[PDB]
Structures are given as C-alpha cells and as structure tokens.
Swiss-Prot record, chain B:
Part of a toxin-antitoxin (TA) system. An RNase. Belongs to the PINc/VapC protein family. It comes from the Bacteria. This is Uncharacterized PIN and TRAM-domain containing protein TTHA0540. The chain holds residues 138 to 268 of 336 of the full protein. Residues 7-118 form the PINc domain. It comes from Thermus thermophilus (strain ATCC 27634 / DSM 579 / HB8). The lineage of its organism: Bacteria, Thermotogati, Deinococcota, Deinococci, Thermales. Mg(2+) binds at residue 85. It is found in: Membrane.
C-alpha cells in the first residue's frame, strides 16, 4: 500500500509548523486534507486566555495558511467513522488512500497496527540531523 | 505540481541522505534512474582512486536502499539533450517528474528550463525547528 491520495494532517504537525516548509520545498505531495475537528481544535486553543495555548492554536493556523500556498489544501467537513480523534484520522486516511502526517507517538503506533502509512516530521528531522 | 515521480542524478545518490528520506516516507515514487547515472556510479566503484571508489560504492549502496523504500526503474536510453544536465532536465520534463539533485548549479538550470527540481539540502534546512 503506497498512497497517492495525498495527506491527512493532524494538530501536532500544524503546531510544529515545519510541515509547511517541507511542502514548499516539494517533499509533501498533495492533495492536503485537514479534518474539520483539527481546525476545531486549533481554534479551541486559539480561544485560550492562556498565552501558551493561544500562541500554539495561532501557530497551527498560520501553518495552514502557508500550506494553502504550496499546494491545494481542503478542509474535510465530512467525517463519519470513529469516536476519538486518532480513530477518525485513521479511517479518514484509508478512505482517501492518503497518508497520515503526524508527530503524535500514540497515533503513529495505532497506524502501524492498522497498516496506515503515516509520515512523521520529527522522524524526518532526526534522519537529516548533522 | 509534477505527478510523474522523481528522477535521481549521480550527486543525490552519492550524498546518500535521499535514502534516509525515502525510508521515512517523504520521497514518493515512482523513482527513475537514468542508465548513464548507474553507469557513472559503476565507473566510480571501479576506479583506481580509493576516493572515487568510496563515492561509487556510496551511490550504489543508496540505490539499493531506495529500491527497498519504493519502486525504482533504471531508464536505459535518453536521446533529448547534449550535456548530462540537459539529459536529466529533458528526461524529467518528458516524464513529468521532478528532478532530485544535490548539485546546486543543476537546481538553477532546472529553474531556467522550467523543470521542477528538489534539493535534499533545502529539505534539511526546512527541518530546522521553529517557534
């Protein structure tokens, strides 16, 4: 299973921010999909009076805006299967035949067990370290 | 925009990191290696000079690792172009693939020819932690 259906992005990678530069440099082939709930999460963070959580919801969003430059990015309103965030991302990735893009340790594990391709920005980074 | 895969030159194979990139999922195929690139790596490995041999081995080693990470085909005839640069550029255009290279100057040449080209070194820079 080698998915040409693009990429489903989670909160962690948008908060990390680097996915945006990886796309622009040509190593993140689209289409790029973000679930409605991920966005719902970045604004629940953005709506914080706590500057730390504010400044990271704010950050996820800027990453989105910058991605909508490198590539077609589209928000998925349509998510039917699954109860937890991790579970919804997985069936989402199988449905579109797209890879997950996430730094999340538990989600990367669930994906190996499901056999869903998942791309980790941190694993990419640690491969290219000096 | 190119949906036709990734043409790999000699320099990217000798650099080796493209093998790290593919094995973590960020080098989507199909992967194409021109015959002249494979011929050149073989010519390095067979050289009298221990340092040419090491580059040759390293690129050959990288090629085998890529063949594990994704589907890879050696394309065994090019007619478009006169220099190695041109051959790589026209081939990538013909395949609607991106060129992947370590060679700074070839990256600029691709810009001039209107061919998409990817740099492992620009990727490594994108991966500087932010915020």
């Amino acid at each position: 299973n080698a998915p040409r259906g693009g990429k489903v992005l989670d909160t962690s990678v948008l908060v990390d921010g680097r996915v945006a530069e990886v796309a622009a440099v040509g190593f993140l082939e689209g289409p790029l999909w973000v679930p409605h709930f991920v966005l719902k999460e970045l604004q629940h963070f953005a709506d914080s009076q706590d500057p730390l959580r504010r400044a990271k919801g704010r950050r996820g969003l800027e990453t989105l805006e910058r991605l909508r430059e490198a590539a077609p990015l589209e928000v998925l309103e349509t998510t039917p299967k699954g109860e937890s965030v991790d579970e919804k991302l997985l069936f989402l990735a199988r449905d579109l035949e797209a890879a997950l893009v996430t730094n999340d340790h538990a989600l990367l594990q669930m994906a190996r067990i499901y056999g869903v391709k998942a791309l980790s920005i941190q694993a990419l980074a640690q491969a290219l370290r000096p």
